[PDB]
Design a protein around this nucleic acid. Sequence first.
RNA 1: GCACCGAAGCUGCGGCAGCGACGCUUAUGCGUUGUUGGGUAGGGGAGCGUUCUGUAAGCCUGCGAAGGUGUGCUGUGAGGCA
RNA 2: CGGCGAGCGAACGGGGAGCAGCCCAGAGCCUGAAUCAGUGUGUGUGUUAGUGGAAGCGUCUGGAAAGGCGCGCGAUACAGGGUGACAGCCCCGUACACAAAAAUGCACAUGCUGUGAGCUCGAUGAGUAGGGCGGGACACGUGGUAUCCUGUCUGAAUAUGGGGGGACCAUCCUCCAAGGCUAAAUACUCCUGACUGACCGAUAGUGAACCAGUACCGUGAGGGAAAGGCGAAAAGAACCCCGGCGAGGGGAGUGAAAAAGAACCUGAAACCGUGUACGUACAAGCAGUGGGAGCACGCUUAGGCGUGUGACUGCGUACCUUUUGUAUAAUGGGUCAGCGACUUAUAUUCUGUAGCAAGGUUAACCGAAUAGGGGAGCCGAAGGGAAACCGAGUCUUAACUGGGCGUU
Lengths: 20, 117, 64, 143, 201
Amino acid sequence: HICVTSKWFNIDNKIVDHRP
Amino acid sequence: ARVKRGVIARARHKKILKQAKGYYGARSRVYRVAFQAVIKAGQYAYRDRRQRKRQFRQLWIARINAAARQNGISYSKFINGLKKASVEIDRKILADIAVFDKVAFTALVEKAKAALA
Amino acid sequence: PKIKTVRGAAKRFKKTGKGGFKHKHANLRHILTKKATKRKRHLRPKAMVSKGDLGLVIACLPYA
Amino acid sequence: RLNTLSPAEGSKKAGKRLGRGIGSGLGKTGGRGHKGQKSRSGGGVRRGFEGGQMPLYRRLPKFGFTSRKAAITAEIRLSDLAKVEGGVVDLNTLKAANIIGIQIEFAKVILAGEVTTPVTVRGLRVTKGARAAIEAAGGKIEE
Amino acid sequence: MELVLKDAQSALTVSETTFGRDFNEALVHQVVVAYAAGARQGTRAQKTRAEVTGSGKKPWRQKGTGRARSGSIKSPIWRSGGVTFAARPQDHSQKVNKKMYRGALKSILSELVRQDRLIVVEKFSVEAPKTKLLAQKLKDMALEDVLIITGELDENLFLAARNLHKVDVRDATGIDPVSLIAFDKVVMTADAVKQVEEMLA
RNA sequence: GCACCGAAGCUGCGGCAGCGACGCUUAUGCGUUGUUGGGUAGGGGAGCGUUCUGUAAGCCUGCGAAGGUGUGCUGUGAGGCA
RNA sequence: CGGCGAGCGAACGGGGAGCAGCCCAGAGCCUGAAUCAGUGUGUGUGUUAGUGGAAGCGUCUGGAAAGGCGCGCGAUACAGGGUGACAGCCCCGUACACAAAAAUGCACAUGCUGUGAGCUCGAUGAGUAGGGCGGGACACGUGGUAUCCUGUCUGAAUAUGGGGGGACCAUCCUCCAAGGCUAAAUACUCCUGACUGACCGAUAGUGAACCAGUACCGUGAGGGAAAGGCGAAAAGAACCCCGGCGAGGGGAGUGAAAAAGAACCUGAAACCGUGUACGUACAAGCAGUGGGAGCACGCUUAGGCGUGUGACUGCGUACCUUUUGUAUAAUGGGUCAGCGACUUAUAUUCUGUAGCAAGGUUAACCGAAUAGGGGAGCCGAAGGGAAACCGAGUCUUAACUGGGCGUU
Ligand SMILES: N[C@@H](Cc1c[nH]c2ccccc12)C(=O)O
Ligand SMILES: N[C@@H](Cc1c[nH]c2ccccc12)C(=O)O
Ligand SMILES: [Mg+2]
Ligand SMILES: [Mg+2]
Ligand SMILES: [Mg+2]
Ligand SMILES: [Mg+2]
Ligand SMILES: [Mg+2]
Ligand SMILES: [Mg+2]
Ligand SMILES: [Mg+2]
Ligand SMILES: [Mg+2]
Ligand SMILES: [Mg+2]
Ligand SMILES: [Mg+2]
Ligand SMILES: [Mg+2]
Ligand SMILES: [Mg+2]
Ligand SMILES: [Mg+2]
Ligand SMILES: [Mg+2]
Ligand SMILES: [Mg+2]
Ligand SMILES: [Mg+2]
Ligand SMILES: [Mg+2]
Ligand SMILES: [Mg+2]
Ligand SMILES: [Mg+2]
Ligand SMILES: [Mg+2]
Ligand SMILES: [Mg+2]
Ligand SMILES: [Mg+2]
Ligand SMILES: [Mg+2]
Ligand SMILES: [Mg+2]
Ligand SMILES: [Mg+2]
Ligand SMILES: [Mg+2]
Ligand SMILES: [Mg+2]
């Protein structure tokens, strides 16, 4: 199809720092 | 010389799926899953060829025992009899006769009792 | 390409007759005055590389 | 008959392939073992290296000195000379019989056994045992 | 070693060492194989990752995307473009010692007699450059598959047989190992025999 | 104190393979017979099949090749034959 | 040569390919005389269209013969492609023999232009050689460092002269710098022609077998796809029926085949349904395995037999990896299919095997081209010593009763 464009981000984003 | 591959491949694969026939879901559909199912079936078998001889012996010994008790004597004494019954040797399966020929059995019990007297 | 001899080793071993290697002893190049004459004396004549190091030396001198 | 020839038995060893399955004997790891520098593409350590320890070919002292004169001296066996072609074994001549090599400028004769045909050797040096063998075979040794 | 001269029964007399010697299978097998190699040309394709067509840009971030590592779009693991150990044009020529080559021919001749597949003749030549002629000579001689090593080689004998498929004609020097074995019968003029006699010493 | 249950240990019956010896018999293979055969890293040995060259202007093939899908048989297996 | 590390790495001499030698630094006479290029013509020879080019029929199977079988025929032609399946004789070719009106590459031969030849007598490359300082080149890292180049400052001799012979000096030997030209053996392939492959066959092979550097992405540089096959022949489905003058479908007809109908050769696997047999709504877990009734189906003549299902039942925590150890609640995998990892070259050593043997073998190159020639050379037959040197010994020491390495 024409149908062919994927610009998948970076992870997605929000949160996490999980105690250091 | 480039090698096509892949005709021999599905040969290997189908060789396995065929062995998986009957298994549930992926175990019979999906090679990656089937190749495992096929192996472990093999593993159990190899094991259970040895188990079979165990399971039946205790099957035999179980019913040898009731019949012995039925003729008023425990399995313990009863094998000891036949042992001591002037040598004499006779399979625990062949004590099959306990189910199909009960006089022959009782008859065997007596012969055993006598040696124990 | 031809192997290159590990040039440093070339300057410290010489293939002998039966295929051995012979070398100069260490410990005889300076700070001598405090060493027994007996010791220094025994360190003059060359000596064969031991069985354990043969492996090394040969790999260093393919064209020995 | 062009499909009835076959090579001598044990002249064509198959040769490790490795990396092809459990049965092969050299699957998975391919006889390289588990981890470390020696596995891994382009692994290994250079010759002479023996961990960071000072290597044998460095603990031991140099003792060279290359003669350079030696490089142009040949040695001659008694077994030669018969093959010199002309009964005169000369400064070169041997050279022409391809038993010395052009660049050579010196030569001893060495008791390396077996001389028969009488021969006169000229301009060479010759050991005590070689002289004796030459002479005892009707040979002559003029300088 | 005498050889029945076929037509004008005469006997030729040949060297026992070059015509009566034991068949050394291995030794011939090395030379025939060797000859079959070196028939080869190199001429070969395949682009290592160094020579597939694309930029050297990293397809996507080391870490972060949920993706496998990925480094070069020309990677053999990836699809289009790869070939881990791409071949190059190469030379399959083997050596074969002088004395081993000769050693093989002798084992081969000295086996062709032993199966009388070698029939030696005083003179062999066709009267005109016409295939049909040669076809007939062979017919009369009871032959289809033949090597026919002529003494000095002539125009007409060559142009005939150029088109007969199972038959070739070579001069004395043109003798190669596969051919001796290739054809069902090797003819050879008694004149050629003497040439070969010496060539092999 | 005498039974008996209980393991892939021991024994029994059949079979394979390596190394032995002894007898039949030696471009060996039989018959015994004693013995050995868990196995990762790894070393050694022997093989199956795939692509391509010769052998091959041969051989198979429209009275049905390759491939696909079943089925029977066969080998210790990779497999093979139909 | 070298933090004498890692590494770098000659020359002398030898075997081969190809070979070729000339001008200026100048004036006199004789003068345009050799020669070179540029150019016109001629000729020959290649090129850019072309021409001729042998010989097969019968029958069987088939939709179709080139196939099988039979009997002929050409072959200096059995290279190859095509044709309804595999064709020497159907077609196009092939071998072979021929052809150029014109334009051209290449050789010669000359015409025109430009150019100098020849003899006599001369001349013989100075801000250079060398040196100092700084670097750079030489295999050579300043090292005892010759030699070459020069940014910088200097600066000769001139044939009775000068350079080099690896610091340096003598002797000897050998060459003539500070001006140039010069063909071949050598390198390369955007492109033209012909031929070849133990090279790939549509995820392979060019990124591209296809209207691909396209569609697409990017402000731009720039990145960069997917996607081949109906049939022998379109004979590509007239006409009829349902339907919205639809989509899609069923007939009809073409064809060997329509299950080859264009979403078209083969048509696997994941994945999703319809149909039938058997099991399943009191039962707990890697889902199988050993046992095992019933049912459906075939058997056999029964005979606890084949196939399918599998109540009930003994045992039973997947795979990989990584680990002292993993059901592990530690890694990796949603599934299938295709692809995806110990190669190649050159050295060196060991084993096997082959040849020959105190010898073995050639490299380039020649080539009647896997032959034959070529033994330059390499390995071995002698070792010991840093070395001179000695030699079945030698080194150690004044010397070994010795000792080290060697002699089998
Ligand atoms: N939530 C993010 C983690 C994260 C935190 N900060 C971010 C910034 C950018 C991208 C991702 C993150 C994840 O799923 O991984
Ligand atoms: N670590 C904090 C804040 C936070 C959210 N996203 C982050 C990304 C990066 C660093 C910190 C954060 C939390 O998770 O509550
Ligand atoms: Mg048991
Ligand atoms: Mg000192
Ligand atoms: Mg690993
Ligand atoms: Mg480790
Ligand atoms: Mg390791
Ligand atoms: Mg020589
Ligand atoms: Mg890059
Ligand atoms: Mg993922
Ligand atoms: Mg590719
Ligand atoms: Mg040769
Ligand atoms: Mg085991
Ligand atoms: Mg195939
Ligand atoms: Mg024509
Ligand atoms: Mg024709
Ligand atoms: Mg001069
Ligand atoms: Mg020049
Ligand atoms: Mg492609
Ligand atoms: Mg395909
Ligand atoms: Mg189709
Ligand atoms: Mg119930
Ligand atoms: Mg449950
Ligand atoms: Mg429970
Ligand atoms: Mg741990
Ligand atoms: Mg471990
Ligand atoms: Mg466990
Ligand atoms: Mg879980
Ligand atoms: Mg896990």
